[PDB]
Amino acid sequence: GVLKIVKVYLAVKRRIQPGDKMAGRHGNKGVISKINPIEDMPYDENGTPV
Amino acid sequence: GSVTEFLKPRLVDIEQVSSTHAKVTLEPLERGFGHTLGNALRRILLSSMPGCAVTEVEIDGVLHEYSTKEGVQEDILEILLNLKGLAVRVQGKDEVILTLNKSGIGPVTAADITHDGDVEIVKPQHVICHLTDENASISMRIKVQRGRGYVPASTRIHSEEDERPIGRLLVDACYSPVERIAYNVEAARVEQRTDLDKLVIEMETNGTIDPEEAIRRAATILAEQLEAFVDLRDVRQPEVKEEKPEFDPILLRPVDDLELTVRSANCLKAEAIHYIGDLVQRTEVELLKTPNLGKKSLTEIKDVLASRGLSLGMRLENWPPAS
Amino acid sequence: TEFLKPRLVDIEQVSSTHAKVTLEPLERGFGHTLGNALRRILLSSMPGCA
Amino acid sequence: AREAKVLRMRFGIDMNTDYTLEEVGKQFDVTRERIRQIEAKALRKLRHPSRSEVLRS
Amino acid sequence: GPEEITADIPNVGEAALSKLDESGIVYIGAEVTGGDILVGKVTPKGETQL
């Protein structure tokens, strides 16, 4: 072609946005829905949520 | 007003099992209320809680968070993650800067941090780094603030520090001091009646907060939110924003948008000239009497003003309407 | 530093008995907290004669 | 009119062929500088409106 | 004509030098978002008529 070129390596970090294709190990396909705070998720006799 | 009976709840024994685990029991409670206040207090505690957390970290010799440093067994990211779970208790501030200098062989814990008279560290044994060689040395500045409800670095794209040096590394914030929250109803053996319950609240925190202010602040939030449930005037918003700019919108921008020399910027900042709305209506006569402003600075102003189309020393006696 | 207050308040009475009330400005979980709380109060903790 | 036509004719808009200071100075009696004076004054008028300002970019 | 890598990009503000150096290349470690400039580059083109 011609002349000089410039490459720029930039790094981004993405979180688990609602819609990411996440699956298990037994063909357990799935798509993340919503986000759902910890304050309103199924818990037991202890503080441990899910 | 003269109806109903009802009762009142009160705090009893706060069994402090450990510095992180605690138990808050509320004995004077009925059956309906004792099981109703459970979810309310639980949700407000597992979220709507203050606490302190690290937001920014500036380390010497490190530009971005994807780099490393000589003599450090852990990379920068790991160090940042170790600073994520840093138990800090600030006395009476909303922003504190903790300096951390440490050299020589050995692990760098939270004890190596310069002990401040305002900052109270719960666990000074918290692993932060692992210096290998004896010639290795690290010096970082940690910024701790007081907030609520997560809020990572992705939320603030650039709404803080217009410049912000390259050295500053942004870290996610875990404000909520409460880890887990559970509660049990249980029949209360109140030496009085027979049909009463004692809402036992099992709590687990990081030790950066005591059950006292925790439960009281939570109930305070619940009360303040129930305050709007009294009267219901159905207040609407007036809206109807005005849509007719009398002057050019550019005059609403500061002098920093002019993009000029430092000296001229200091002169405008010393002459009480913040926006360009004042500089655009300031004659050269007043600019000549300005300290440290010669021919170069004046030519600089007229060139950076005429380029944007505007002029110098005009008149528009409509400043500033009309909020 | 603290929290905000609900400002937009609407109430429509589909008669003298049936009614609907909406409050817009609210944080996470608060809608459900006050929801369940008021629900548990209105369904038993209310006086009245029968 | 003696300013709209001036700016219009000088920079040549909505009339195809654009003219110079001389061809406009002859059709308006006073030659050169005078027609340039008004041409400059018109530019002075456009220092407040934001339409063309934002149209710039 | 040839295309050069410079920082003298036409129609730019203070955001130019904000992320870019004296040459026209973004500093290593700078935070960039959708819209920012990474490499200053200009291409020659006269005529245009206007």
Side-chain angles (χ1 to χ4, degrees), chain B residues 247-250 306 308-311 314 316, chain D residues 44 46-51 53-54 56-57:
Chain B
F247 52 85
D248 195 276
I250 297 184
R308 296 288 71 179
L310 292 68
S311 179
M314 303 187 305
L316 32 284
Chain D
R44 302 283 75 169
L46 285 310
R47 250 73 181 176
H48 305 332
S50 173
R51 302 188 177 184
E53 176 79 67
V54 185
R56 181 205 82 267
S57 176

mmCIF file with all atom_site columns, all heavy atoms in Angstrom, chain B residues 247-250 306 308-311 314 316, chain D residues 44 46-51 53-54 56-57:
data_model
loop_
_atom_site.group_PDB
_atom_site.id
_atom_site.type_symbol
_atom_site.label_atom_id
_atom_site.label_alt_id
_atom_site.label_comp_id
_atom_site.label_asym_id
_atom_site.label_entity_id
_atom_site.label_seq_id
_atom_site.pdbx_PDB_ins_code
_atom_site.Cartn_x
_atom_site.Cartn_y
_atom_site.Cartn_z
_atom_site.occupancy
_atom_site.B_iso_or_equiv
_atom_site.pdbx_formal_charge
_atom_site.auth_seq_id
_atom_site.auth_comp_id
_atom_site.auth_asym_id
_atom_site.auth_atom_id
_atom_site.pdbx_PDB_model_num
ATOM 1   N N   . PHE B 1 247 ? -30.761 34.538 23.468 1.00 0.00 ? 247 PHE B N   1
ATOM 2   C CA  . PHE B 1 247 ? -29.389 34.752 23.024 1.00 0.00 ? 247 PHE B CA  1
ATOM 3   C C   . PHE B 1 247 ? -28.736 33.444 22.591 1.00 0.00 ? 247 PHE B C   1
ATOM 4   O O   . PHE B 1 247 ? -29.305 32.367 22.768 1.00 0.00 ? 247 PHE B O   1
ATOM 5   C CB  . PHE B 1 247 ? -28.566 35.406 24.134 1.00 0.00 ? 247 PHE B CB  1
ATOM 6   C CG  . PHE B 1 247 ? -28.655 34.693 25.453 1.00 0.00 ? 247 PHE B CG  1
ATOM 7   C CD1 . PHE B 1 247 ? -27.827 33.619 25.734 1.00 0.00 ? 247 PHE B CD1 1
ATOM 8   C CD2 . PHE B 1 247 ? -29.571 35.095 26.410 1.00 0.00 ? 247 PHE B CD2 1
ATOM 9   C CE1 . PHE B 1 247 ? -27.910 32.961 26.947 1.00 0.00 ? 247 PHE B CE1 1
ATOM 10  C CE2 . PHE B 1 247 ? -29.659 34.441 27.625 1.00 0.00 ? 247 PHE B CE2 1
ATOM 11  C CZ  . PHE B 1 247 ? -28.828 33.373 27.893 1.00 0.00 ? 247 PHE B CZ  1
ATOM 12  N N   . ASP B 1 248 ? -27.539 33.546 22.022 1.00 0.00 ? 248 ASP B N   1
ATOM 13  C CA  . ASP B 1 248 ? -26.805 32.371 21.567 1.00 0.00 ? 248 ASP B CA  1
ATOM 14  C C   . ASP B 1 248 ? -26.419 31.493 22.753 1.00 0.00 ? 248 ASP B C   1
ATOM 15  O O   . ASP B 1 248 ? -25.928 31.991 23.765 1.00 0.00 ? 248 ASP B O   1
ATOM 16  C CB  . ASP B 1 248 ? -25.558 32.788 20.786 1.00 0.00 ? 248 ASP B CB  1
ATOM 17  C CG  . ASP B 1 248 ? -24.958 31.644 19.990 1.00 0.00 ? 248 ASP B CG  1
ATOM 18  O OD1 . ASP B 1 248 ? -24.185 30.855 20.571 1.00 0.00 ? 248 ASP B OD1 1
ATOM 19  O OD2 . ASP B 1 248 ? -25.259 31.538 18.782 1.00 0.00 ? 248 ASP B OD2 1
ATOM 20  N N   . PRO B 1 249 ? -26.643 30.177 22.626 1.00 0.00 ? 249 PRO B N   1
ATOM 21  C CA  . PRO B 1 249 ? -26.390 29.219 23.708 1.00 0.00 ? 249 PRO B CA  1
ATOM 22  C C   . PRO B 1 249 ? -24.908 29.084 24.048 1.00 0.00 ? 249 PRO B C   1
ATOM 23  O O   . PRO B 1 249 ? -24.575 28.612 25.136 1.00 0.00 ? 249 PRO B O   1
ATOM 24  C CB  . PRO B 1 249 ? -26.923 27.903 23.134 1.00 0.00 ? 249 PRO B CB  1
ATOM 25  C CG  . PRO B 1 249 ? -26.834 28.072 21.658 1.00 0.00 ? 249 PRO B CG  1
ATOM 26  C CD  . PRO B 1 249 ? -27.139 29.518 21.407 1.00 0.00 ? 249 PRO B CD  1
ATOM 27  N N   . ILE B 1 250 ? -24.035 29.495 23.133 1.00 0.00 ? 250 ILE B N   1
ATOM 28  C CA  . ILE B 1 250 ? -22.595 29.393 23.351 1.00 0.00 ? 250 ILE B CA  1
ATOM 29  C C   . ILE B 1 250 ? -22.130 30.299 24.491 1.00 0.00 ? 250 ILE B C   1
ATOM 30  O O   . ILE B 1 250 ? -21.154 29.994 25.177 1.00 0.00 ? 250 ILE B O   1
ATOM 31  C CB  . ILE B 1 250 ? -21.801 29.719 22.067 1.00 0.00 ? 250 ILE B CB  1
ATOM 32  C CG1 . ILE B 1 250 ? -22.120 28.700 20.971 1.00 0.00 ? 250 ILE B CG1 1
ATOM 33  C CG2 . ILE B 1 250 ? -20.307 29.735 22.347 1.00 0.00 ? 250 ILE B CG2 1
ATOM 34  C CD1 . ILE B 1 250 ? -21.315 28.892 19.704 1.00 0.00 ? 250 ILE B CD1 1
ATOM 35  N N   . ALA B 1 306 ? -12.842 35.758 17.893 1.00 0.00 ? 306 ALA B N   1
ATOM 36  C CA  . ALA B 1 306 ? -13.243 36.029 16.518 1.00 0.00 ? 306 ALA B CA  1
ATOM 37  C C   . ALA B 1 306 ? -13.361 34.741 15.710 1.00 0.00 ? 306 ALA B C   1
ATOM 38  O O   . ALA B 1 306 ? -14.129 34.669 14.750 1.00 0.00 ? 306 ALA B O   1
ATOM 39  C CB  . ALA B 1 306 ? -12.262 36.984 15.856 1.00 0.00 ? 306 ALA B CB  1
ATOM 40  N N   . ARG B 1 308 ? -14.531 31.895 16.805 1.00 0.00 ? 308 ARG B N   1
ATOM 41  C CA  . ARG B 1 308 ? -15.816 31.282 17.120 1.00 0.00 ? 308 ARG B CA  1
ATOM 42  C C   . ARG B 1 308 ? -16.970 32.128 16.590 1.00 0.00 ? 308 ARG B C   1
ATOM 43  O O   . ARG B 1 308 ? -18.138 31.823 16.833 1.00 0.00 ? 308 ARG B O   1
ATOM 44  C CB  . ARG B 1 308 ? -15.961 31.080 18.630 1.00 0.00 ? 308 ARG B CB  1
ATOM 45  C CG  . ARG B 1 308 ? -14.957 30.109 19.242 1.00 0.00 ? 308 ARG B CG  1
ATOM 46  C CD  . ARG B 1 308 ? -15.255 28.664 18.861 1.00 0.00 ? 308 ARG B CD  1
ATOM 47  N NE  . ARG B 1 308 ? -14.974 28.387 17.455 1.00 0.00 ? 308 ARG B NE  1
ATOM 48  C CZ  . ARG B 1 308 ? -15.137 27.200 16.879 1.00 0.00 ? 308 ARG B CZ  1
ATOM 49  N NH1 . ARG B 1 308 ? -15.584 26.173 17.588 1.00 0.00 ? 308 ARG B NH1 1
ATOM 50  N NH2 . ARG B 1 308 ? -14.854 27.041 15.594 1.00 0.00 ? 308 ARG B NH2 1
ATOM 51  N N   . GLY B 1 309 ? -16.634 33.192 15.868 1.00 0.00 ? 309 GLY B N   1
ATOM 52  C CA  . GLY B 1 309 ? -17.634 34.064 15.280 1.00 0.00 ? 309 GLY B CA  1
ATOM 53  C C   . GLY B 1 309 ? -17.930 35.284 16.129 1.00 0.00 ? 309 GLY B C   1
ATOM 54  O O   . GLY B 1 309 ? -18.259 36.350 15.608 1.00 0.00 ? 309 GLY B O   1
ATOM 55  N N   . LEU B 1 310 ? -17.811 35.128 17.444 1.00 0.00 ? 310 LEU B N   1
ATOM 56  C CA  . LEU B 1 310 ? -18.099 36.215 18.374 1.00 0.00 ? 310 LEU B CA  1
ATOM 57  C C   . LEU B 1 310 ? -17.056 37.326 18.282 1.00 0.00 ? 310 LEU B C   1
ATOM 58  O O   . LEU B 1 310 ? -16.028 37.175 17.620 1.00 0.00 ? 310 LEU B O   1
ATOM 59  C CB  . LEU B 1 310 ? -18.187 35.690 19.811 1.00 0.00 ? 310 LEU B CB  1
ATOM 60  C CG  . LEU B 1 310 ? -19.363 34.776 20.174 1.00 0.00 ? 310 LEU B CG  1
ATOM 61  C CD1 . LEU B 1 310 ? -19.265 33.431 19.467 1.00 0.00 ? 310 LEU B CD1 1
ATOM 62  C CD2 . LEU B 1 310 ? -19.448 34.586 21.683 1.00 0.00 ? 310 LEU B CD2 1
ATOM 63  N N   . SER B 1 311 ? -17.331 38.444 18.946 1.00 0.00 ? 311 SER B N   1
ATOM 64  C CA  . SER B 1 311 ? -16.414 39.578 18.955 1.00 0.00 ? 311 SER B CA  1
ATOM 65  C C   . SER B 1 311 ? -15.959 39.891 20.375 1.00 0.00 ? 311 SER B C   1
ATOM 66  O O   . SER B 1 311 ? -16.079 39.057 21.273 1.00 0.00 ? 311 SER B O   1
ATOM 67  C CB  . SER B 1 311 ? -17.075 40.808 18.330 1.00 0.00 ? 311 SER B CB  1
ATOM 68  O OG  . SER B 1 311 ? -16.199 41.921 18.345 1.00 0.00 ? 311 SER B OG  1
ATOM 69  N N   . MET B 1 314 ? -18.795 43.634 23.190 1.00 0.00 ? 314 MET B N   1
ATOM 70  C CA  . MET B 1 314 ? -20.131 43.927 22.684 1.00 0.00 ? 314 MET B CA  1
ATOM 71  C C   . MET B 1 314 ? -21.076 44.253 23.837 1.00 0.00 ? 314 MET B C   1
ATOM 72  O O   . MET B 1 314 ? -20.649 44.351 24.987 1.00 0.00 ? 314 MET B O   1
ATOM 73  C CB  . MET B 1 314 ? -20.676 42.750 21.872 1.00 0.00 ? 314 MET B CB  1
ATOM 74  C CG  . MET B 1 314 ? -19.791 42.341 20.704 1.00 0.00 ? 314 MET B CG  1
ATOM 75  S SD  . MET B 1 314 ? -20.553 41.091 19.650 1.00 0.00 ? 314 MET B SD  1
ATOM 76  C CE  . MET B 1 314 ? -20.932 39.816 20.848 1.00 0.00 ? 314 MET B CE  1
ATOM 77  N N   . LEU B 1 316 ? -25.072 43.277 25.425 1.00 0.00 ? 316 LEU B N   1
ATOM 78  C CA  . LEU B 1 316 ? -26.323 42.532 25.428 1.00 0.00 ? 316 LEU B CA  1
ATOM 79  C C   . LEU B 1 316 ? -26.906 42.497 26.836 1.00 0.00 ? 316 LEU B C   1
ATOM 80  O O   . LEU B 1 316 ? -26.953 41.445 27.474 1.00 0.00 ? 316 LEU B O   1
ATOM 81  C CB  . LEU B 1 316 ? -26.119 41.108 24.893 1.00 0.00 ? 316 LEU B CB  1
ATOM 82  C CG  . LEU B 1 316 ? -24.790 40.373 25.120 1.00 0.00 ? 316 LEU B CG  1
ATOM 83  C CD1 . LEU B 1 316 ? -23.705 40.896 24.187 1.00 0.00 ? 316 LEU B CD1 1
ATOM 84  C CD2 . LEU B 1 316 ? -24.333 40.451 26.572 1.00 0.00 ? 316 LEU B CD2 1
ATOM 85  N N   . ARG D 2 44  ? -21.535 41.647 10.767 1.00 0.00 ? 44  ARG D N   1
ATOM 86  C CA  . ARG D 2 44  ? -21.644 42.111 12.143 1.00 0.00 ? 44  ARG D CA  1
ATOM 87  C C   . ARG D 2 44  ? -23.014 41.757 12.711 1.00 0.00 ? 44  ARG D C   1
ATOM 88  O O   . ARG D 2 44  ? -23.156 41.502 13.906 1.00 0.00 ? 44  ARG D O   1
ATOM 89  C CB  . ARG D 2 44  ? -21.431 43.625 12.214 1.00 0.00 ? 44  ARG D CB  1
ATOM 90  C CG  . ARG D 2 44  ? -20.096 44.110 11.669 1.00 0.00 ? 44  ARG D CG  1
ATOM 91  C CD  . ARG D 2 44  ? -18.958 43.865 12.647 1.00 0.00 ? 44  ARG D CD  1
ATOM 92  N NE  . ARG D 2 44  ? -18.563 42.461 12.697 1.00 0.00 ? 44  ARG D NE  1
ATOM 93  C CZ  . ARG D 2 44  ? -17.472 42.015 13.312 1.00 0.00 ? 44  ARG D CZ  1
ATOM 94  N NH1 . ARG D 2 44  ? -16.664 42.867 13.930 1.00 0.00 ? 44  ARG D NH1 1
ATOM 95  N NH2 . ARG D 2 44  ? -17.187 40.720 13.308 1.00 0.00 ? 44  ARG D NH2 1
ATOM 96  N N   . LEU D 2 46  ? -24.741 39.102 12.128 1.00 0.00 ? 46  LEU D N   1
ATOM 97  C CA  . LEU D 2 46  ? -24.805 37.683 12.462 1.00 0.00 ? 46  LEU D CA  1
ATOM 98  C C   . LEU D 2 46  ? -23.782 37.292 13.527 1.00 0.00 ? 46  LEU D C   1
ATOM 99  O O   . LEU D 2 46  ? -22.822 36.574 13.249 1.00 0.00 ? 46  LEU D O   1
ATOM 100 C CB  . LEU D 2 46  ? -24.620 36.828 11.206 1.00 0.00 ? 46  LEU D CB  1
ATOM 101 C CG  . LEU D 2 46  ? -25.822 36.768 10.261 1.00 0.00 ? 46  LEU D CG  1
ATOM 102 C CD1 . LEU D 2 46  ? -27.093 36.431 11.030 1.00 0.00 ? 46  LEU D CD1 1
ATOM 103 C CD2 . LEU D 2 46  ? -25.984 38.071 9.491  1.00 0.00 ? 46  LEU D CD2 1
ATOM 104 N N   . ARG D 2 47  ? -23.997 37.771 14.747 1.00 0.00 ? 47  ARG D N   1
ATOM 105 C CA  . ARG D 2 47  ? -23.132 37.429 15.871 1.00 0.00 ? 47  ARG D CA  1
ATOM 106 C C   . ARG D 2 47  ? -23.967 37.066 17.095 1.00 0.00 ? 47  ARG D C   1
ATOM 107 O O   . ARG D 2 47  ? -23.439 36.892 18.193 1.00 0.00 ? 47  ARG D O   1
ATOM 108 C CB  . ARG D 2 47  ? -22.193 38.591 16.197 1.00 0.00 ? 47  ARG D CB  1
ATOM 109 C CG  . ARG D 2 47  ? -20.735 38.334 15.847 1.00 0.00 ? 47  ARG D CG  1
ATOM 110 C CD  . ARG D 2 47  ? -20.500 38.364 14.343 1.00 0.00 ? 47  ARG D CD  1
ATOM 111 N NE  . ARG D 2 47  ? -19.103 38.097 14.007 1.00 0.00 ? 47  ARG D NE  1
ATOM 112 C CZ  . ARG D 2 47  ? -18.638 37.982 12.767 1.00 0.00 ? 47  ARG D CZ  1
ATOM 113 N NH1 . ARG D 2 47  ? -19.458 38.108 11.733 1.00 0.00 ? 47  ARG D NH1 1
ATOM 114 N NH2 . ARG D 2 47  ? -17.350 37.739 12.559 1.00 0.00 ? 47  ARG D NH2 1
ATOM 115 N N   . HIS D 2 48  ? -25.277 36.963 16.893 1.00 0.00 ? 48  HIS D N   1
ATOM 116 C CA  . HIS D 2 48  ? -26.206 36.630 17.970 1.00 0.00 ? 48  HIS D CA  1
ATOM 117 C C   . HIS D 2 48  ? -27.071 35.410 17.644 1.00 0.00 ? 48  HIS D C   1
ATOM 118 O O   . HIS D 2 48  ? -27.226 34.523 18.484 1.00 0.00 ? 48  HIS D O   1
ATOM 119 C CB  . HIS D 2 48  ? -27.079 37.836 18.329 1.00 0.00 ? 48  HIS D CB  1
ATOM 120 C CG  . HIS D 2 48  ? -26.297 39.061 18.686 1.00 0.00 ? 48  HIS D CG  1
ATOM 121 N ND1 . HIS D 2 48  ? -25.030 39.006 19.224 1.00 0.00 ? 48  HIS D ND1 1
ATOM 122 C CD2 . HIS D 2 48  ? -26.604 40.376 18.581 1.00 0.00 ? 48  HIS D CD2 1
ATOM 123 C CE1 . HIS D 2 48  ? -24.590 40.233 19.436 1.00 0.00 ? 48  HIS D CE1 1
ATOM 124 N NE2 . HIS D 2 48  ? -25.526 41.084 19.054 1.00 0.00 ? 48  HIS D NE2 1
ATOM 125 N N   . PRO D 2 49  ? -27.646 35.366 16.427 1.00 0.00 ? 49  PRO D N   1
ATOM 126 C CA  . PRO D 2 49  ? -28.432 34.199 16.005 1.00 0.00 ? 49  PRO D CA  1
ATOM 127 C C   . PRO D 2 49  ? -27.630 32.902 16.093 1.00 0.00 ? 49  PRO D C   1
ATOM 128 O O   . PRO D 2 49  ? -26.425 32.901 15.844 1.00 0.00 ? 49  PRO D O   1
ATOM 129 C CB  . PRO D 2 49  ? -28.764 34.518 14.546 1.00 0.00 ? 49  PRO D CB  1
ATOM 130 C CG  . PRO D 2 49  ? -28.796 36.002 14.499 1.00 0.00 ? 49  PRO D CG  1
ATOM 131 C CD  . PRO D 2 49  ? -27.706 36.452 15.433 1.00 0.00 ? 49  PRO D CD  1
ATOM 132 N N   . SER D 2 50  ? -28.304 31.812 16.446 1.00 0.00 ? 50  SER D N   1
ATOM 133 C CA  . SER D 2 50  ? -27.634 30.536 16.680 1.00 0.00 ? 50  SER D CA  1
ATOM 134 C C   . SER D 2 50  ? -27.854 29.530 15.553 1.00 0.00 ? 50  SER D C   1
ATOM 135 O O   . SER D 2 50  ? -27.195 28.491 15.509 1.00 0.00 ? 50  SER D O   1
ATOM 136 C CB  . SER D 2 50  ? -28.087 29.934 18.013 1.00 0.00 ? 50  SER D CB  1
ATOM 137 O OG  . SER D 2 50  ? -27.578 28.623 18.179 1.00 0.00 ? 50  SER D OG  1
ATOM 138 N N   . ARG D 2 51  ? -28.787 29.836 14.657 1.00 0.00 ? 51  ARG D N   1
ATOM 139 C CA  . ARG D 2 51  ? -29.114 28.943 13.546 1.00 0.00 ? 51  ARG D CA  1
ATOM 140 C C   . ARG D 2 51  ? -27.886 28.554 12.725 1.00 0.00 ? 51  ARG D C   1
ATOM 141 O O   . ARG D 2 51  ? -27.505 27.384 12.680 1.00 0.00 ? 51  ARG D O   1
ATOM 142 C CB  . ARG D 2 51  ? -30.183 29.571 12.649 1.00 0.00 ? 51  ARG D CB  1
ATOM 143 C CG  . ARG D 2 51  ? -31.471 29.914 13.376 1.00 0.00 ? 51  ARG D CG  1
ATOM 144 C CD  . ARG D 2 51  ? -32.562 30.346 12.412 1.00 0.00 ? 51  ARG D CD  1
ATOM 145 N NE  . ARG D 2 51  ? -33.823 30.605 13.102 1.00 0.00 ? 51  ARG D NE  1
ATOM 146 C CZ  . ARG D 2 51  ? -34.959 30.922 12.487 1.00 0.00 ? 51  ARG D CZ  1
ATOM 147 N NH1 . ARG D 2 51  ? -34.995 31.019 11.166 1.00 0.00 ? 51  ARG D NH1 1
ATOM 148 N NH2 . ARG D 2 51  ? -36.059 31.141 13.195 1.00 0.00 ? 51  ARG D NH2 1
ATOM 149 N N   . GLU D 2 53  ? -24.938 29.307 13.412 1.00 0.00 ? 53  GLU D N   1
ATOM 150 C CA  . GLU D 2 53  ? -23.894 28.970 14.374 1.00 0.00 ? 53  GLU D CA  1
ATOM 151 C C   . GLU D 2 53  ? -23.789 27.461 14.562 1.00 0.00 ? 53  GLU D C   1
ATOM 152 O O   . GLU D 2 53  ? -22.705 26.886 14.464 1.00 0.00 ? 53  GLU D O   1
ATOM 153 C CB  . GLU D 2 53  ? -24.168 29.647 15.719 1.00 0.00 ? 53  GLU D CB  1
ATOM 154 C CG  . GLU D 2 53  ? -23.183 29.282 16.820 1.00 0.00 ? 53  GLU D CG  1
ATOM 155 C CD  . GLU D 2 53  ? -21.872 30.033 16.706 1.00 0.00 ? 53  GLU D CD  1
ATOM 156 O OE1 . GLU D 2 53  ? -21.876 31.268 16.894 1.00 0.00 ? 53  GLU D OE1 1
ATOM 157 O OE2 . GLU D 2 53  ? -20.837 29.390 16.432 1.00 0.00 ? 53  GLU D OE2 1
ATOM 158 N N   . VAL D 2 54  ? -24.925 26.824 14.835 1.00 0.00 ? 54  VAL D N   1
ATOM 159 C CA  . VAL D 2 54  ? -24.967 25.378 15.014 1.00 0.00 ? 54  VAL D CA  1
ATOM 160 C C   . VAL D 2 54  ? -24.874 24.661 13.672 1.00 0.00 ? 54  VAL D C   1
ATOM 161 O O   . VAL D 2 54  ? -24.414 23.521 13.596 1.00 0.00 ? 54  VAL D O   1
ATOM 162 C CB  . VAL D 2 54  ? -26.251 24.934 15.739 1.00 0.00 ? 54  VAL D CB  1
ATOM 163 C CG1 . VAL D 2 54  ? -26.208 23.443 16.031 1.00 0.00 ? 54  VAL D CG1 1
ATOM 164 C CG2 . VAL D 2 54  ? -26.434 25.725 17.026 1.00 0.00 ? 54  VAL D CG2 1
ATOM 165 N N   . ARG D 2 56  ? -22.892 25.407 11.504 1.00 0.00 ? 56  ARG D N   1
ATOM 166 C CA  . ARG D 2 56  ? -21.464 25.376 11.211 1.00 0.00 ? 56  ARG D CA  1
ATOM 167 C C   . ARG D 2 56  ? -20.859 24.018 11.550 1.00 0.00 ? 56  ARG D C   1
ATOM 168 O O   . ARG D 2 56  ? -20.595 23.206 10.662 1.00 0.00 ? 56  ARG D O   1
ATOM 169 C CB  . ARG D 2 56  ? -20.739 26.479 11.987 1.00 0.00 ? 56  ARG D CB  1
ATOM 170 C CG  . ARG D 2 56  ? -19.244 26.544 11.721 1.00 0.00 ? 56  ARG D CG  1
ATOM 171 C CD  . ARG D 2 56  ? -18.500 27.176 12.887 1.00 0.00 ? 56  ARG D CD  1
ATOM 172 N NE  . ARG D 2 56  ? -18.252 26.216 13.959 1.00 0.00 ? 56  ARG D NE  1
ATOM 173 C CZ  . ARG D 2 56  ? -19.056 26.037 15.002 1.00 0.00 ? 56  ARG D CZ  1
ATOM 174 N NH1 . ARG D 2 56  ? -20.164 26.754 15.118 1.00 0.00 ? 56  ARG D NH1 1
ATOM 175 N NH2 . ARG D 2 56  ? -18.750 25.143 15.933 1.00 0.00 ? 56  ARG D NH2 1
ATOM 176 N N   . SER D 2 57  ? -20.643 23.782 12.841 1.00 0.00 ? 57  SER D N   1
ATOM 177 C CA  . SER D 2 57  ? -20.047 22.538 13.320 1.00 0.00 ? 57  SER D CA  1
ATOM 178 C C   . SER D 2 57  ? -18.679 22.286 12.694 1.00 0.00 ? 57  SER D C   1
ATOM 179 O O   . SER D 2 57  ? -17.745 23.064 12.887 1.00 0.00 ? 57  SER D O   1
ATOM 180 C CB  . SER D 2 57  ? -20.979 21.355 13.048 1.00 0.00 ? 57  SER D CB  1
ATOM 181 O OG  . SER D 2 57  ? -20.375 20.132 13.435 1.00 0.00 ? 57  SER D OG  1
#
